[PDB]
Amino acid sequence: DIRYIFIVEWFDTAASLIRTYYLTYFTQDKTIEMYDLKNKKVFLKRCEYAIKDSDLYIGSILNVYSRQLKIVDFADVFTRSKFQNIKEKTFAMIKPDAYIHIGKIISIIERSGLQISNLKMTKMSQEDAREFYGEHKGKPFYDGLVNFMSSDLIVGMELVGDNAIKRWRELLGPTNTLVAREQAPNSIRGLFGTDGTRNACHGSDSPGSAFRELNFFFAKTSKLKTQAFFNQCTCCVIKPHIVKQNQVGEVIDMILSEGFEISALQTFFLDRPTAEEFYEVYKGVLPEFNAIAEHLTSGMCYALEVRQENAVKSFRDIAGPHDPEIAKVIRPNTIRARFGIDRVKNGIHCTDLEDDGVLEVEYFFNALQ
Amino acid sequence: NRGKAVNEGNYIKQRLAELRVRSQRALNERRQKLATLLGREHEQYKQEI
Amino acid sequence: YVSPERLNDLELILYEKIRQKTLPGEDEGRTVYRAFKYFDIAEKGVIDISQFKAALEKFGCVFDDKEIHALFSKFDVNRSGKICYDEFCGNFARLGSGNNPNVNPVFKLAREVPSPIINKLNADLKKQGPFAFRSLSKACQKADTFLNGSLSHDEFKWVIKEIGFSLTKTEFDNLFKFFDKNYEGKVIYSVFIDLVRGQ
Amino acid sequence: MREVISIHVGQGGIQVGNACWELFCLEHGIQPDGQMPSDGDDAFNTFFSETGAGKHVPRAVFLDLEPTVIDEVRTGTYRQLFHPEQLISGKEDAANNFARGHYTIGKEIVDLCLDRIRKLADNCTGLQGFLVFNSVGGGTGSGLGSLLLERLSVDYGKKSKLGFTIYPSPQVSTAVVEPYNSILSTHSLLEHTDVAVMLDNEAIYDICRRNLDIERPTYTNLNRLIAQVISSLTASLRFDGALNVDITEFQTNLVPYPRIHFMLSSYAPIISAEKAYHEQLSVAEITNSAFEPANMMAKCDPRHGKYMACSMMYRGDVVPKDVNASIATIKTKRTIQFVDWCPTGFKVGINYQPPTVVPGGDLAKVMRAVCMISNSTAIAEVFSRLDHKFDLMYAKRAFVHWYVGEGMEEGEFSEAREDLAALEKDYEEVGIET
Amino acid sequence: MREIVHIQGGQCGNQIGAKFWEVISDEHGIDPTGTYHGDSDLQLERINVYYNEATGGRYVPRAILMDLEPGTMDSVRAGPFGQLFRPDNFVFGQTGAGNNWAKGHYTEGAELIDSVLDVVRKEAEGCDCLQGFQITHSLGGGTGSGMGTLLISKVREEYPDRIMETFSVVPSPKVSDTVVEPYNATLSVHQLVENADECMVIDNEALYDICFRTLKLTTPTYGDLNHLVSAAMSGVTCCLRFPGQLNSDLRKLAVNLIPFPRLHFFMIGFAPLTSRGSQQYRALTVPELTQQMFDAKNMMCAADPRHGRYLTASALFRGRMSTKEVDEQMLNVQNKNSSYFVEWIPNNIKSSICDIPPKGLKMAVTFVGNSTAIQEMFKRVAEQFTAMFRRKAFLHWYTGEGMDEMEFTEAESNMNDLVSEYQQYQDATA
Amino acid sequence: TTLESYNKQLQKGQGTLIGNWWEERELRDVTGIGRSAHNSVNDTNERTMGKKFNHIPNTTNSEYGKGFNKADQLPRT
Ligand SMILES: Nc1nc2c(ncn2[C@@H]2O[C@H](COP(=O)(O)OP(=O)(O)OP(=O)(O)O)[C@@H](O)[C@H]2O)c(=O)[nH]1
Ligand SMILES: Nc1nc2c(ncn2[C@@H]2O[C@H](COP(=O)(O)OP(=O)(O)O)[C@@H](O)[C@H]2O)c(=O)[nH]1
Numbered sequence A: 001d002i003r004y005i006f007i008v009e010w011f012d013t014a015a016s017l018i019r020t021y022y023l024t025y026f027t028q029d030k031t032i033e034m035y036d037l038k039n040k041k042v043f044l045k046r047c048e049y050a051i052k053d054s055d056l057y058i059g060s061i062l063n064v065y066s067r068q069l070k071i072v073d074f075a076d077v078f079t080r081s082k083f084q085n086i087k088e089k090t091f092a093m094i095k096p097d098a099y100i101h102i103g104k105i106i107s108i109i110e111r112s113g114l115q116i117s118n119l120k121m122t123k124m125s126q127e128d129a130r131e132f133y134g135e136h137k138g139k140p141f142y143d144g145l146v147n148f149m150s151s152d153l154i155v156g157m158e159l160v161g162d163n164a165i166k167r168w169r170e171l172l173g174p175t176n177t178l179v180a181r182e183q184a185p186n187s188i189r190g191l192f193g194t195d196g197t198r199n200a201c202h203g204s205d206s207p208g209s210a211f212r213e214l215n216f217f218f219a220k221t222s223k224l225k226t227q228a229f230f231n232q233c234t235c236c237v238i239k240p241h242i243v244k245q246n247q248v249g250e251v252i253d254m255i256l257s258e259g260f261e262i263s264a265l266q267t268f269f270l271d272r273p274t275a276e277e278f279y280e281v282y283k284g285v286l287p288e289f290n291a292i293a294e295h296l297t298s299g300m301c302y303a304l305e306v307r308q309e310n311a312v313k314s315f316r317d318i319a320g321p322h323d324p325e326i327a328k329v330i331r332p333n334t335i336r337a338r339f340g341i342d343r344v345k346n347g348i349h350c351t352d353l354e355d356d357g358v359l360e361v362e363y364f365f366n367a368l369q
Numbered sequence B: 001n002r003g004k005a006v007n008e009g010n011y012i013k014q015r016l017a018e019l020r021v022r023s024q025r026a027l028n029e030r031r032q033k034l035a036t037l038l039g040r041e042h043e044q045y046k047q048e049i
Numbered sequence C: 001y002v003s004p005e006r007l008n009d010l011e012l013i014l015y016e017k018i019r020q021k022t023l024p025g026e027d028e029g030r031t032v033y034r035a036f037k038y039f040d041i042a043e044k045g046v047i048d049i050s051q052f053k054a055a056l057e058k059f060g061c062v063f064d065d066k067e068i069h070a071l072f073s074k075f076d077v078n079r080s081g082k083i084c085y086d087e088f089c090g091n092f093a094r095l096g097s098g099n100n101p102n103v104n105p106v107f108k109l110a111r112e113v114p115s116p117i118i119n120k121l122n123a124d125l126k127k128q129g130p131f132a133f134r135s136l137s138k139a140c141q142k143a144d145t146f147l148n149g150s151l152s153h154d155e156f157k158w159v160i161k162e163i164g165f166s167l168t169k170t171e172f173d174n175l176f177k178f179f180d181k182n183y184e185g186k187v188i189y190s191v192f193i194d195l196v197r198g199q
Numbered sequence D: 001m002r003e004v005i006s007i008h009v010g011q012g013g014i015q016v017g018n019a020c021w022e023l024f025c026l027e028h029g030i031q032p033d034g035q036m037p038s039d040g041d042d043a044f045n046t047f048f049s050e051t052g053a054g055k056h057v058p059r060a061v062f063l064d065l066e067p068t069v070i071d072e073v074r075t076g077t078y079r080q081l082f083h084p085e086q087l088i089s090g091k092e093d094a095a096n097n098f099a100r101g102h103y104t105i106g107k108e109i110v111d112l113c114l115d116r117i118r119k120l121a122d123n124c125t126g127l128q129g130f131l132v133f134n135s136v137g138g139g140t141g142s143g144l145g146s147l148l149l150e151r152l153s154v155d156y157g158k159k160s161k162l163g164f165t166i167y168p169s170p171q172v173s174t175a176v177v178e179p180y181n182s183i184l185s186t187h188s189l190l191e192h193t194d195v196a197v198m199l200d201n202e203a204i205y206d207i208c209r210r211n212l213d214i215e216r217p218t219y220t221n222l223n224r225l226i227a228q229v230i231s232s233l234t235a236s237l238r239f240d241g242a243l244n245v246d247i248t249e250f251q252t253n254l255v256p257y258p259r260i261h262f263m264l265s266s267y268a269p270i271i272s273a274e275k276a277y278h279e280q281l282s283v284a285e286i287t288n289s290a291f292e293p294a295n296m297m298a299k300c301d302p303r304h305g306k307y308m309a310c311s312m313m314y315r316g317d318v319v320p321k322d323v324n325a326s327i328a329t330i331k332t333k334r335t336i337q338f339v340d341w342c343p344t345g346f347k348v349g350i351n352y353q354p355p356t357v358v359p360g361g362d363l364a365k366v367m368r369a370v371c372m373i374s375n376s377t378a379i380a381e382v383f384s385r386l387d388h389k390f391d392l393m394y395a396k397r398a399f400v401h402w403y404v405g406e407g408m409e410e411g412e413f414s415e416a417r418e419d420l421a422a423l424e425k426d427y428e429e430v431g432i433e434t
Numbered sequence E: 001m002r003e004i005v006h007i008q009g010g011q012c013g014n015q016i017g018a019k020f021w022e023v024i025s026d027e028h029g030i031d032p033t034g035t036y037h038g039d040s041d042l043q044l045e046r047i048n049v050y051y052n053e054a055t056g057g058r059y060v061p062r063a064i065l066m067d068l069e070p071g072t073m074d075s076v077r078a079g080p081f082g083q084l085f086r087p088d089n090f091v092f093g094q095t096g097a098g099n100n101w102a103k104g105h106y107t108e109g110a111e112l113i114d115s116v117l118d119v120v121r122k123e124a125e126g127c128d129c130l131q132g133f134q135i136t137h138s139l140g141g142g143t144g145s146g147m148g149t150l151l152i153s154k155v156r157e158e159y160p161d162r163i164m165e166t167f168s169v170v171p172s173p174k175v176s177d178t179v180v181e182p183y184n185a186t187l188s189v190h191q192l193v194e195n196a197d198e199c200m201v202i203d204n205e206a207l208y209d210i211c212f213r214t215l216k217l218t219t220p221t222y223g224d225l226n227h228l229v230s231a232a233m234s235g236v237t238c239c240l241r242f243p244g245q246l247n248s249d250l251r252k253l254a255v256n257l258i259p260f261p262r263l264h265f266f267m268i269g270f271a272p273l274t275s276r277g278s279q280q281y282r283a284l285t286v287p288e289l290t291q292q293m294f295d296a297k298n299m300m301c302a303a304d305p306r307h308g309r310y311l312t313a314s315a316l317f318r319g320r321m322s323t324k325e326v327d328e329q330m331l332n333v334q335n336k337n338s339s340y341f342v343e344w345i346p347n348n349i350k351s352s353i354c355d356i357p358p359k360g361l362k363m364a365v366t367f368v369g370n371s372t373a374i375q376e377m378f379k380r381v382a383e384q385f386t387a388m389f390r391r392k393a394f395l396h397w398y399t400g401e402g403m404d405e406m407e408f409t410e411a412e413s414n415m416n417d418l419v420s421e422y423q424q425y426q427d428a429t430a
Numbered sequence F: 001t002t003l004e005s006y007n008k009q010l011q012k013g014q015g016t017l018i019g020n021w022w023e024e025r026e027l028r029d030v031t032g033i034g035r036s037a038h039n040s041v042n043d044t045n046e047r048t049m050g051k052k053f054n055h056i057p058n059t060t061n062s063e064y065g066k067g068f069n070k071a072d073q074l075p076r077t
């Protein structure tokens, strides 16, 4: 039938040098086949591996036969044309009046079909929020919006998908929330908006504005400090398999609804030595460190900070046992029992010692920042 | 005249080992503390089954 | 300050030292050209102020920083901060070529259109059909999914490859040299499409 | 404190010095511009000298009469490394004539070369010796190298000289008049060089093919292999190890008689990046591959002759205990035979530094390596075949007028032939038992 | 920088030289207006070899044009690339030679060469370091063979050490277009053996044969033939202008290729030559290149090398390749055809590599060979000479203006001796 | 040799299918004047050399210093 051909690049460890292959994908029956540039020998021939269609994109990381590959670029015009349409970027912004609805907002975005390439939560100060929305100035809406923005925490997002610049807004709803209820009740604002200046979220209007915002927020040269506390708190990490399975929206809201105040969360990509040192408290410790360390670096993950009166054990009560198989029997209404699948991919990860919670959250938000 | 540099270099590599053992011992007790915590809980979880 | 004739006085001082080191049978343009290529290690074709100061120091013309800035600023008209020594050397070649009404000094003061690679593209595009020129413009717009007005190194390769032209590495270097004059890393496709179509 | 001066004369000499200095810079971490980021022992003092603030300059001198190779060296990526006046370039190529580069046009460059070497020696304080890289089957190589050796041997005296020459292969060669220049250069070097290493080209072609599965070898690969050999030989002078060997412990162990100092080299392991990690790479087997006759870099069969002295320089994580067992097995093996008057024939040097690998190369990253320089009586075969080639074409005085017309006296051919015959006779006599 | 000067005489030299300067200018990226518009920096490193730079930045070739009539000089000036040549470098008479050797060598040649010798002398000392001379002329004509060989003698006594090359168009009886060829062919050959260091003979019939069969061109013209000759000329001095792995200049060619002083006549060839309609259907590899360059029908001479034994040959590879194939292929062809190479000299083939091939090509090879099979040209010419000199026909024109039959006997005698000694080593054994 | 003969001037098409018809067609297609433009000047470059693949490679001596390993920049421990 039709074939999609990429270029993959795997970093060997016993051999320092890095190699490259093709990873041909026969979409007629979903079968994998790899051929290499150098020495001209077939590497892995015509064997199915159950690789989904949605995860194929530039920069994606997929694991096959215990060696993980990284797609770098396409290989021919036929493959390039099909996937170059899904490259649009847009800036989604969650305003500080819908803070309690973050999990519900994220979930319906996920079912919309778009993809969240990057995400971070921060507080916009007085001066930079004034420079932002700089095109308004004279409008009276400008001062009110500037005063509103610096009120509390904000969640910023970058969505990647097909026609995302306008697909984001059509589910976002009319800019005024009051008219949204009678026009399109099933929308972000129709569900979570109070008035015009306190609308639910914000979207991008032009590609130039998308460039202006994306470099203002997610670029390296950014003046947005990761506002987070380092006392009376613990850290919880959403494992990559949950992100791939699309339940991150269903976990954030569940954590928020239990009475835990979340202070900061960010998106991270981490390597094996970095993931190895995170579980150095689990190095030769009970849980068979190797597999859990390897899986944590197998893709994108969400790192969260949770603050409560008694952060460590109270959160550990609702997280449940680290084995979902044993959690399901005895604590049926806990996160790991309801989300985890097995020992190595047990949904969420939370620290389980009274005194080491301060450094655990400091590692992600200070050391790895 | 180069003997001054050699003495300082040996001093640093001697002290790094001295500070390494203290850091390792402090982290080694957390290895034992966490092992006992999970060990007791499995007995509790097994008894509930 | 050094806006007045002090600015052009240093050129005469610099020109004399170039002439003294000029090899027999060679013009002053080649003499100063090899000085700049000696310093830049990227071989990109553009230099910064630090490399420019070092190159002048080789000839012995070392001045204070405030004079060096003006010399860099006079030739850096666009204020991008990256001068091309191709224009620098050509300027001094005409200065030493002398004044003679009977003979023109030709030489180069601006990077020329490459020529034959553009002509070959125009002839080949005519073979596809009446709407081939639409495809080249359509390809650039659709490849540039973000609507910024420029394309990168690899993206330009894909657009040419998408049309069906398997240009070699040398041909890309010539085309990319003129269109990305000071090596911003991006090329404006709007200028490129205008030139290949014609007038 | 301890330094060597490397002489690179001739097209082959420069084209191998390129790889040698690339490898040295990459091994000591010196950037091509000359600054060392580091991030500090003075292990570089052997090959580079600090300028007082920043860059390090090599103790290298380049000679050639055609500016083609020198100009591209001045133009390429190493333009800021070498001293600008240490790359001496002539005017007219010697044009494959020995007499040209030794009597008429090569006489106006030796003054400059000697001046530069004198300045380098004065800058140096603990000079160990000289390393000479030159081409034998060429015009400006053989003649100018001979003249430089003659000048140095009287100008400096007892300083050691080590030469890495490139002899013509028995069948695969480029020039046609090469037997004359080769014979004359042999007569010149026999009396003035203290250590000579045969580095013909065809053998290395077979090495690259059979080991790396490369069907299209080029001069770059051969130069990289030669540079690896040079670095493995000279590592112990600048790196720390259990058993250290310097160059005066080399001659004292490898030169039984003053007129017998011709040797040939071997290197192992030489494996690609694909087959290296499926194989054991033990110490016992690399020393077997080193003594394997097909692995030597000179087209000669050791099985037709005896062994007089072998030097084994191990680098990596080698243990002295294992070396003794491997040497015992080698001695027990009956195919490899020694001379009766040499009961002990091995000198061992061990260095801690593992071999360095150049990116984009053919060799893989290994942890152990050995280079063996051996003196044997089997080397007489190359002289025999060279003599056979010379006499066959000298009977009818072919191409002689090219040499006499430039100033060479015809009587030098007979003297060179007699010297080569005497050397062959001396080699034959030593091999007999007592 | 060991630059070479170019002298072209007669109608052949003017036409061949004009086509030659077109190829070199294209190779070096020089427009017909003389302004550099090249691509790579490698094209300027050694541009001084063939060009002189004038004030204003335009490059002018260092060539001298010779003729006894303005018939061909006006056309080349009016033709393409005709503005490159400096007008002071055009020297000509007003009478012509009329296909008479003595007129161009004794009466009109002597009076006219005083002016041109001044032009050559000024050109030579102006440059830094000479490397040699190269000559393009014809031996079957009047002004080319007559005046041409006189200047070879004149410049030889002034520059005894510099090398000198000739690209000689010797006549072949099959293309019979002059009835006085045997007379002035022998005389030019006799004078050419004591002065020229390297001679490369060319035949029109061989060139016509290549065009019809190899290029499969239905009807060629002198424009096509002049390009093939110009291609071989540029390939000889390839390593003199561009970086390579084994550089070889003109002197290195003579040392390897000339065993004896009087054996300096060569036959050349070019590869690869391919028809327009079958270029994409074959691969360009060293085994393919070496197969065609030893083909007996690929060389520019009508003589069949399979009727003699090679003494020495040289191959000048160009482009990117591996030295292992170059060395292996030369050894392979030297062993499977051991009957065609003389035994008393081992490894009688030289190879050289230059990294820059001609524009539009990946690899190319220039073959220069020294074989005993060139005696056929001198044997056949001598046969026609004595057949016509026996009856003293067509003789009064020469003897009527200061020529004598004595040196006609001398010229025939020496050439006959050259034939005898040249094929002597064919039968010689160690 | 009886070429030319029974095939006079023409543009496009296979021709008359006699003699050297096939070879002349590609020559005519690439450049207009497939047989000896009368005395549209003819350029001897394409008729003799052939199709041009313009490219100027490196000298193999500006190839020693440049060589890069992407893995050695990994942060490691
Ligand atoms: N292995 C190897 N041999 C080389 C190299 N370059 C030259 N040679 C050897 O040199 C011999 C020919 O002499 P050249 O080096 O080319 O020239 P030369 O020695 O400088 O003498 P001249 O020709 O007068 O300049 C060949 O037979 C090669 O074996 C090289 O890069 N690698
Ligand atoms: N290959 C080739 N041969 C030519 C050319 N012009 C003339 N000839 C040959 O030269 C011969 C005539 O020589 P001619 O010009 O009379 O010699 P000249 O009188 O001394 O100049 C003829 O047989 C032609 O075949 C040319 O442009 N190319």
Ligand SMILES: [Mg+2]
Binding pocket: D010, D011, D064, D065, D066, D093, D094, D140
């Ligand atoms: Mg040389």
